[PDB]
With several copies, the nearest count.
Chain A
Amino acid sequence: AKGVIQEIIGVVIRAKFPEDEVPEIYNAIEIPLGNGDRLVCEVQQQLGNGVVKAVAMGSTDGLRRGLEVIDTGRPIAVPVGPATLGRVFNVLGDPIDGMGPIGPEVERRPIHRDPPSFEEQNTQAQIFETGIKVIDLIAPFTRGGKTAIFGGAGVGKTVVIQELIANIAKEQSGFSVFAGVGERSREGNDLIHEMKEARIDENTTVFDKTVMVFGQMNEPPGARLRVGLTALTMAEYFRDEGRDILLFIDNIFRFVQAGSEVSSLLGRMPSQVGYQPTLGTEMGELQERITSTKRGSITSMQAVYVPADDYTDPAPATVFSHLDATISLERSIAERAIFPAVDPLASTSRILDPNIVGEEHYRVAQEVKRVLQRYKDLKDIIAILGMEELSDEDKLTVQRARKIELFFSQPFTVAQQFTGRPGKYVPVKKTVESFARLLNGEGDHIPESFFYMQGDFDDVLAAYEASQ
């Protein structure tokens, strides 16, 4: 304990400790910083004669060299238990809501814990109904399994996440944890607060069953780097005692970007496009903790931001192998005013198996993909020549594909703020029936424009009758 700061490079602080009291790899050291409030750094490396390199996870832009640092001797500890329910925390576990601090009697758990072993893994999963046609048909939201949506900058990842929460957080049958590792403090939070506090479950709000840890974009790289681990530690307590947990981590890519900035400041050799050499290991350490085990189940739902529109970027490429259900949002689909913007061809799921989701559901999904696969094959032919050169069956499949593409669009109850269309909740059975009817041939006479932003097939038929 009682070291001194040697260098302050960005948010990376190199401190010198006595020879026999060097902090451990992941210990949390503190600068008094004056004013009675301290800056909690996390060690990352040990460089030699008592010299350690720590990540500030704070402003670290008003402190000098030679400042003393106090070694706590333990990694970052965050409160866990029912006391964390309905509260908002930092990466450090310090509450930021108007309510008081967590009492000392509440257990503090280190945010760096080993992921569940191979024995503890629970492979049992089943479809989690969500009411979104494209999600519940092509890439079923998996209960007890990791799933994530990959979108660019203009697509509505946040809208989809908010609608999903509105649909499924009321009938939770358990607590939930939200972690915006990297997201706008406007819509990622302080507006999800209003939505969650407005929703009421038998005189108890949804927010009364939720633990929320942000580390918003504004925060320095350390907070965005470790906020995911804080949320995971807060949710593992509830998973370990059997409670079903809904976990919503927003923009894992921001966690990766924070890791990249920290690594760049740490002097590590860059890999690929400026990313950290330890990208795969960091992703493994975070993601392998998001697992439903034999003691409890975590129904994770993540979001991933692709830089520019590159799906070959190392961060989404690393995420892709850590998921059960993959949802891909495309810029072109969104620019075609299809707000869900999900690409069925590039979106898959593990539980899209007839033994799990249902034989009819599986057949319908496979046909809805074989169509639009024919369409992707004939895209160039249509673009340069036109519909006429195709054969009759090819033509029919093409307009069926366009009708399906239009029909995947669905109004969202959270889209009322900029769209006047009321939201719709289409059950998975209704979605399967509607798409089976559409593929049978029913609805062929209906023009494609009638499938835009509708509910089930009955709503499309009713609109067609209204317009005669």
Chain B
Amino acid sequence: MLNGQLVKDALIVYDDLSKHAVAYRQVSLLLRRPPGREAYPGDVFYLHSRLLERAARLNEEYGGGSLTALPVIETQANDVSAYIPTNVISITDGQIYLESDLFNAGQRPALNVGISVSRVGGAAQTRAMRAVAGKLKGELAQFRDLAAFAQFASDLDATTKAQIERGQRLQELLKQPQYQPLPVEDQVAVLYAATNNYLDDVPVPLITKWRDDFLAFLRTAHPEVRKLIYDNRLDRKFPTPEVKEALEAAIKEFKATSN
């Protein structure tokens, strides 16, 4: 019983499964069981598979409940090809790689979106999010591809320069601070603004401030656009002219008023 509603969804975070594997190795070696690879016992994949396969989304006949698991693993010197990291990568349905190189470079969430994957895919996104983030993923992937030319070449055409600029816009958009989550309507609004060229004239260093100011705008000036976005985020065609208006209008008003 949660907030007067029978909640049947659970979200479990194993703070570190590498330490759990270390504990199992300790208890196995103290029991004098034969070791395996890297002194871990033989059935450590069985260990973690037992642990993780209990996270499931039951059908309506069995209750309709769910249990979301977020295993956490530290990797020594970013060695993904180790034993426990590869085991739990095989077990899980998705991976979120955080890099120290991206973390130091200012990308605070530090996700390596190039190699982070989610096998569930768009089925685990709201229809608004699914409709808006496809262009995000495509543009970010192409920016990652063109970073090779961006690093060296200075004679690239205006198309490539603008495309690198757009990639930088999106990357600076993803730079989220700590303890400031953004609800689904807010992320949808920001990504719609960014992917529809409304953010092109904003310089890169001020994009985070632009997003914060835009969210203050929607939270204060136009709460109704946020309510409208959140209300119909599940429709098959999210960008309906109704949701399309009063949102582009809000972006235009914010752009005209500030800067």
Contacts and interface: CB of A to CB of B under 8 A. Distances in A.
B1 interface: no
8 contacts: A186-B120, A257-B46, A264-B33, A279-B22, A310-B37, A312-B76, A389-B152, A417-B122
Given A377-B101, A418-B119, A274 B86 contact: no
Contacts, number: 152
| Interface size, B (range) | 35 or more
Complex A-B, nearest 10 residue pairs according to Cβ-Cβ distance, in ascending order? A274-B36, A153-B89, A153-B86, A277-B29, A270-B34, A312-B76, A218-B53, A373-B104, A418-B122, A217-B49
Given A369-B104, A370-B104, A221 B34 contact: no
B49 to A, nearest CB: 4
A154 B80 contact: yes
Given A153-B90, A261-B46, A373-B104, A331 B81 contact: yes
Nearest to B86: A153
Contacts of A264: 33-34, 41-43
Interface in B153-181: 154
Interface in A60-78: none
Interface of B: 16, 19, 22-23, 25-26, 29-30, 32-39, 41-43, 45-46, 49-50, 53-54, 56-57, 74, 76-77, 79-83, 85-91, 93, 95, 100-101, 104-106, 114-115, 117-120, 122-123, 134, 138, 141, 145, 151-152, 154
B171 to A, nearest CB: 13
A307 interface: yes
Contacts of A281: 26
Nearest to A385: B152
A191 B114 CA distance: 26
Nearest to A417: B122
Contacts of B19: 280, 321
A373 B119 contact: no
Contact of B46 (A153, A221, A313, A374): A221
Interface of A: 152-154, 158-159, 184-187, 191, 216-218, 221, 257, 260-261, 264, 268-275, 277-281, 305, 307-313, 317, 321, 331, 334-335, 337, 345-346, 366, 369-370, 372-374, 376-377, 381, 389, 391, 417-418, 420, 449
Contact of B118 (A257, A370, A418): A418
Nearest to B74: A321
Contacts of A420: 134, 138
Contacts of A186: 56-57, 93, 120
Contacts of B120: 186-187, 191, 417
A156 B30 CA distance: 37
A361 B244 CA distance: 43
Contacts of B79: 312
A345 B100 contact: yes
A308 B39 contact: no
B208 to A, nearest CB: 13
A345 B80 CA distance: 20
